[PDB]
Design a protein around this ligand. Structure first.
Ligand SMILES: *[C@@H]1O[C@H](CO)[C@@H](O[C@@H]2O[C@H](CO)[C@@H](O[C@@H]3O[C@H](CO[C@H]4O[C@H](CO)[C@@H](O)[C@H](O[C@H]5O[C@H](CO)[C@@H](O)[C@H](O)[C@@H]5O[C@H]5O[C@H](CO)[C@@H](O)[C@H](O)[C@@H]5O)[C@@H]4O)[C@@H](O)[C@H](O[C@H]4O[C@H](CO)[C@@H](O)[C@H](O)[C@@H]4O[C@H]4O[C@H](CO)[C@@H](O)[C@H](O)[C@@H]4O)[C@@H]3O)[C@H](O)[C@H]2NC(C)=O)[C@H](O)[C@H]1NC(C)=O
Ligand SMILES: O=C(N[C@@H]1COC2(C1)CN(C(=O)OCc1cc(Cl)cc(Cl)c1)C2)c1ccc2nn[nH]c2c1
Ligand SMILES: [Ca+2]
Ligand SMILES: [Ca+2]
Ligand code: NA
Ligand code: NA
Ligand SMILES: [Zn+2]
Length: 805
């Protein structure tokens, strides 16, 4: 119940929301069906439209008009945005030369440059170039301020997951808005775009920017706008708020446009009908900037122009139907479209079985346009598993396609020609970022970055401490002229042991064998040198990784590689080695095929054993430093140390052996040498964070050797590839991956073919940031370089995407 009989007189677009049942006059009252009886009359005036004309200049003020052109309007803060242009001979902002904003030029009483976020739904990154001729205001923001060629959204590339990630710095699995539609089994409640459940605060986790600001004494404009409030009135409302007295005036504002998404769904991303929505968005930017110029705020405010996601061509005919795969299609509930999520239709059905649904959906049709995953097996870069609102079965849908349960869902719900939601590395899904103002840099292009990083920067622009989030604070310092955040590197928590030779061969009873008992002061001194770290500068290029939790581990040196060996997990946490352009690949010699060698530096009690592998009929082993890339026949023996062994399913060994035997040398040839750090990851609770010992669900049978859920590698070289990776004077270049350690290759439909036809495709799908590996391992990389720490933070957030230009 709302008592709509109160009045909006002097309350139009009030910032503080009044509680039930008193009627509202805020920018969201329409959405709650709660506005006072006279809200339209008083607050949504439209008389005489939105632009001053010559005959209106100096008019007698008529309070009925949508905006004003009377002499008093600047002091009232309610002129039409073109008032000074029409009536006072001023230029449009877009027609002025751009001139660097070296310091804020703000009116007296301004404590800080305000921030205005101008968000555009469905604005695909390539519109910035492809539509530039019809968007002169946006093109001036872009060219004169700071811009990226694109900004990467979060998955799924849907509206509310992205907007709320922009507002919070959090992945959707952490803020809880994991789709535009959701079921929460704990609440037993459903979130939909239509209706009231979506306003309940229990959906919305983390701390959005307007709450962060308010708690720290910085006032905020309200971020959401009811759909019926026209854009011209939104801009005029912002400009009016900006004319409030100092103590009442907000410092952060948001404008939202439902375009170009609205038309992109109807006409496709490049439909000829798309030009007009781009022109109309540009005209709105023009109104805001002209309005700021009138207020003498155009060299005071920071403006961010940012989208939520892009738009792909998708039509009704490119739909896969689960009814062509599943016998039991009526026993499942599907959340459909550009991603699929499956759960049981009834929790009382004991015939429901996820394993049989997955198998029925796996590589069943030659050109199949979606792939099923248990959520924990999704690429870790999507960070899309750790929330009870994310169903266990996920379908990753190919770009340009939909999935649906039955054909009748698609015609009894072609209309649409565009959609979004796909994998956030897909080029069509990328969106836009421009920052313009005194705090942003002038005429500066920055590399693409992820939208999870923006919250921290918005906090920096407002002098706020960000709530805990998934950005890496400092990684976007290069966007900013001032207000940079200068983090310190985390402190190392565990220091390593450096063991020398402490055990005789006969103390070991590991069930291992090696044909190495075939045997010089010219060469004995040299091998002792290698075991003390004489080659370490070659193989450990950026310092040893820091271990940021409490544990017991040893540094182990060798001719060709260095490692951090965990006494708790019985294997390395990391193994580091450099492969030059000139390196040669060799075979594992016949006499050494099954060779494993006790490491006389590490106790039998803290070693793996070969008997456990012999007895575990499902599990084999591989090596982290590859024997194929040994520097000499004699150095090759080090590669067979029991301290370089890790557990690997035979199916996974196909992937790993091809990476090590073929791809590392290919990368060194292409990049002029590479430094590789490889290791295990344990994330059995799929939270994206390093497991403790007591979270491990699987061991090599009969033993205490834990089985990794994934194996990672970080592959670094010189950005200037004219310099070899081990003699690089300047910035670095990195690519990394986190491969799932699975007992089959069912994810790769072509895995019966030679590894040359499918392995690298798998690796690309599981591309990762170094920061993703940091979270998963509790390690901190690149501690000793010649680079600034913020530059290193940017490097650690880099994702190599393998998408075309
Ligand atoms: C991305 O960045 C974010 C933000 O930094 C990272 O997420 C943080 O990660 C922490 C570890 O997973 C987590 O810390 C836990 O906090 C618990 C208290 O949580 C509440 O309070 C906070 C602070 O206000 C609040 O933000 C929380 O909000 C979450 O939960 C509500 C639902 O109630 C959601 O609306 C909201 O969206 C958010 O959900 C997300 O996080 C939760 C986990 O909290 C997930 O379950 C969701 O699926 C979703 O992802 C909460 O309201 C605290 O209770 C925990 O402490 C337990 O564990 C420690 C182990 O050290 C132990 O000392 C304690 O005793 C305790 O154990 C006891 O409980 C266990 C489970 O019940 C039980 O097994 C034991 O036997 C014990 O009884 C823990 O400290 C922190 O909350 C989140 N924050 C957010 C916002 O998500 C995220 O990790 C980053 N991601 C990556 C990949 O880097
Ligand atoms: O636009 C859609 N839905 C409605 C219309 O407007 C909304 C919900 C109100 N809100 C708002 O004013 O946003 C301000 C803001 C800025 C930041 Cl930077 C951060 C935040 Cl959190 C909010 C967005 C929609 C729905 C379904 C779809 N399916 N496909 N495409 C779809 C689009
Ligand atoms: Ca959207
Ligand atoms: Ca974990
Ligand atoms: Na075995
Ligand atoms: Na396969
Ligand atoms: Zn949309």
């Amino acid at each position: 119940w709302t008592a709509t009989s109160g009045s909006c007189k002097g309350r139009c677009f009030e910032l503080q929301e009044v509680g039930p049942p008193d009627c509202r006059c805020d920018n969201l009252c329409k959405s709650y069906s709660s506005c006072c009886h006279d809200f339209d009359e008083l607050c949504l005036k439209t008389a005489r439209g939105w632009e001053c004309t010559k005959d209106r200049c100096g008019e007698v003020r008529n309070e009925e008009n949508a905006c004003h052109c009377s002499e008093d309007c600047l002091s009232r803060g309610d002129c039409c945005t073109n008032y000074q242009v029409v009536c006072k001979g001023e230029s449009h902002w877009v027609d002025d030369d751009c001139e660097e904003i070296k310091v804020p030029e703000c009116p007296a009483g301004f404590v800080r440059p305000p921030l205005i976020i101008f968000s555009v739904d469905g604005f695909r990154a390539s519109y910035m170039k492809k539509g530039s001729k019809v968007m002169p205001n946006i093109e001036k923001l872009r060219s004169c301020g700071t811009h990226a060629p694109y900004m990467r959204p979060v998955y799924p590339t849907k509206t509310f997951p992205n907007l709320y990630t922009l507002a919070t710095g959090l992945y959707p699995e952490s803020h809880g808005i994991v789709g535009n539609s959701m079921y929460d089994p704990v609440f037993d409640a459903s979130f939909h775009l239509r209706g009231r459940e979506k306003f309940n605060h229990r959906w919305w986790g983390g701390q959005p920017l307007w709450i962060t600001a308010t708690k720290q004494g910085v006032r905020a404009g309200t971020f959401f706008w009811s759909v019926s409030i026209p854009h011209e009135r939104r801009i005029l409302t912002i400009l009016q708020w900006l004319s409030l007295p100092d103590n009442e005036r907000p410092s952060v504002y948001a404008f939202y446009s439902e375009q170009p998404d609205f038309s992109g769904h109807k006409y496709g991303p490049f439909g000829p009908e798309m030009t007009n929505p781009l022109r109309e968005i540009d005209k709105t930017v023009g109104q805001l900037m002209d309005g700021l110029k009138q207020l003498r705020l155009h060299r005071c405010v920071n403006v961010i122009f940012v989208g939520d996601h892009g738009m792909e061509d998708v039509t009704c005919d490119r739909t896969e139907f689960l009814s062509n795969y599943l016998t039991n299609v009526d026993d499942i509930t599907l959340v459909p479209g550009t991603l699929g999520r499956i759960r049981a239709k009834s929790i009382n059905n004991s015939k429901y079985d996820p394993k049989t649904i997955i198998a029925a959906l796996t590589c069943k049709k030659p050109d199949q346009h979606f792939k099923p995953y248990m959520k924990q097996h999704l690429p870790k870069r999507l960070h899309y598993a750790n929330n009870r609102r994310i169903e266990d079965i996920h379908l990753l849908v190919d770009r340009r396609w939909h999935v649906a349960r039955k054909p009748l869902d698609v015609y009894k719900k072609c209309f649409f020609q565009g959609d979004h939601g796909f994998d956030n590395k897909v080029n069509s899904m990328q969106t836009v970022f421009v920052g313009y103002g005194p705090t942003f840099k002038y005429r500066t292009k920055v590399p693409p970055f992820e939208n999870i990083e923006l919250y921290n920067v918005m906090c920096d622009l407002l002098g706020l401490k960000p709530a805990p989030n998934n950005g890496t604070h400092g990684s976007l310092n290069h966007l900013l002229r001032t207000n940079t955040f200068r983090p310190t590197m985390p402190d190392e928590v565990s220091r390593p042991n450096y063991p020398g030779i402490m055990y005789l061969q006969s103390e070991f009873d590991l069930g291992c064998t090696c044909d190495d008992k075939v045997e010089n002061k010219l060469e004995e001194l040299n091998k002792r040198l290698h075991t003390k770290g004489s080659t370490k500068e070659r193989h450990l290029l950026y310092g040893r990784p820091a271990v940021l939790y409490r544990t017991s581990y040893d540094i182990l040196y060798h001719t060709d590689f260095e490692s951090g060996y965990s006494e708790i997990f019985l294997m390395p946490l990391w193994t580091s080695y450099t492969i030059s352009k000139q390196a040669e690949v060799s075979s594992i010699p016949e006499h050494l095929t099954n060779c494993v060698r006790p490491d006389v530096r590490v106790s039998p009690g803290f070693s793996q054993n070969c008997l456990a592998y012999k007895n575990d009929k499902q599990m084999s082993y591989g090596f982290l430093f590859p024997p194929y890339l040994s520097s000499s026949p004699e150095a090759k023996y080090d590669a067979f140390l029991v301290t370089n062994m890790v557990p690997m399913y035979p199916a996974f060994k196909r992937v790993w052996a091809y990476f090590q035997r073929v791809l590392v040398k290919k990368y060194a040839s292409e990049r002029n040498g590479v430094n590789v750090i490889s290791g295990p990851i344990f994330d059995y609770n799929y939270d994206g964070l390093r497991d403790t010992e007591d979270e491990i669900k699987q061991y090599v049978e009969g033993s205490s050797i834990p089985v990794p859920t994934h194996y990672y590698s970080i592959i670094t070289s010189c950005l200037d590839f004219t310099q070899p990776a081990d003699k690089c004077d300047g910035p670095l270049s990195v690519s990394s991956f986190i491969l799932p350690h699975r007992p089959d290759n069912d994810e790769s439909c072509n895995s019966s073919e030679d590894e040359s036809k499918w392995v690298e495709e798998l690796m690309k799908m599981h591309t990762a940031r170094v920061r993703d590996i940091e979270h998963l391992t509790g390690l901190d990389f690149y501690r000793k370089t010649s680079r600034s720490y913020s530059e290193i933070l940017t490097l650690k957030t880099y994702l190599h995407t393998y998408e075309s230009e």
